[PDB]
Amino acid sequence: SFAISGDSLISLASTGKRVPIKDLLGEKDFEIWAINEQTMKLESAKVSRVFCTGKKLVYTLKTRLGRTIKATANHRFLTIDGWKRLDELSLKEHIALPRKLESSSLQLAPEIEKLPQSDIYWDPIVSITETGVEEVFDLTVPGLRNFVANDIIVHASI
Amino acid sequence: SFAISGDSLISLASTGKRVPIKDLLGEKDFEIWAINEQTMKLESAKVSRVFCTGKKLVYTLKTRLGRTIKATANHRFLTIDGWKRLDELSLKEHIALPRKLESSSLQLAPEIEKLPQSDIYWDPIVSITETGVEEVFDLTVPGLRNFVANDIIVHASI
């Protein structure tokens, strides 16, 4: 059981807006953005449950591009070596952020043949800090089992 | 003196359309797209002259993404090792194409902090073939001394 702060902003694929995970408690059957680890591309994926795991100690993780999230010590992030717990990460280690690049011709027509292959931006960690006890939440994403929260790829429930 | 076929399509920065270089003969004071070799970014740049060098033997060069141009044997293209003549290139050698990537957030806001640094796509050569004698043209780009023709970075006159 791992989880994230209720303030964490979930990117919602149907609306193009974000909502904090706490505000989605008890909602379901909505789409988030997930990485497909086989293709390294982002796909929309359905949330089947959003739940609170109680009050837990959370830690703020920050990356070089300023992405930040508060998560439990056992919460997993995606490194080049696979999924790793927050309390196993070290500074300068890269974690996966989503990236959305579009490739156009000089005439502003689509030019997908020049698109970089992966939808991941690998960003180094610059801070990991114990922050305090908060109500924490997670969600279930059957199939791909990950989602974007605060513009970071995080693992869903197991 | 090197040159390209009159059919070669010049990307015009003000209009977002292309025109064959022959149709620009005698025109000037218009902007094309050029690579800045110091920053590796594309910039608009002014054409001061468009001229015909006569009838010359031209060669078709083609890359893996299907970019193709007809140019003289001494016409230069940009490799990772600098500018090289058509008659010095070999198959699988990469040459520079422009690329225009845009980086957006998952909410479709600009997200330039994740943009790849270079505006070049390095594409391998798949064919170099003597084609025939044609009227050929080039142009002068003071300062950056290159331009995009048939979606390939080519050197301007000297």
Author numbering:
A (entry chain A), B (entry chain A): -1 to 156
Question: What does the study report here?
Answer:
Inteins are protein elements that remove themselves from their precursor proteins in an autocatalytic pathway called protein splicing. In the first step of the canonical class 1 inteins, the scissile peptide bond upstream of the intein rearranges in an N–S (or N–O) acyl shift involving the cysteine (or serine) side chain as the first amino acid of the intein (residue 1) and the upstream flanking amino acid of the N-extein (residue (–1)). The M86 mutant of the Ssp DnaB intein (here referred to as WT intein) was selected by sequential directed evolution for its more general activity and is one of the few known intein mutants with improved extein promiscuity.
The importance of steric demand was confirmed by the crystal structure of the M86 precursor intein with the G(–1)F mutation and revealed a constraint imposed around the scissile bond. The sterically demanding Phe side chain in the M86(G(–1)F) mutant is partially squeezed between the His73 imidazole side chain and the N-terminal scissile bond, pushing both moieties slightly apart. The distance between the imidazole ring of the histidine side chain and the amide nitrogen of Ala1 increased from 2.9 Å in the M86 structure (with the π-nitrogen as reference point) to 3.2 or 4.3 Å in the G(–1)F mutant (δ-carbon as reference point), for which two very similar His73 conformers can be observed, indicating increased mobility of this residue. This finding suggests that the polar interaction between the δ-nitrogen of the histidine and the scissile bond amide has been disrupted, at least partially, potentially resulting in a loss of the catalytic contribution of the histidine side chain in case of the M86(G(–1)F) mutant. Consistent with this interpretation is a re-orientation of the His73 imidazole ring, which is flipped in both conformers of the G(–1)F mutant, such that its δ-nitrogen is not facing the amide nitrogen anymore. Instead, the flipped imidazole ring of one of the His73 conformers is stabilized directly by the key Asp136 residue of the block F motif, which also displays a rotated side chain relative to the M86 structure and is within the H-bonding distance of 2.9 Å to the imidazole ring. The flipped orientation of the other His73 conformer in the G(–1)F mutant is assisted by a water molecule (water 145) that is not present in the M86 structure and establishes hydrogen bonds to both the Asp136 side chain and the imidazole moiety. Importantly, the G(–1)F mutation also leads to changes within the backbone geometry around the scissile peptide bond, which expresses itself in changes of the dihedral φ-, ψ- and ω-angles between the (–1) position and Ala1. In the M86(G(–1)F) mutant, the ω-angle (–173°) shows a comparable deviation from the perfect 180° as observed for the WT intein (174°), albeit with an inverted plane.
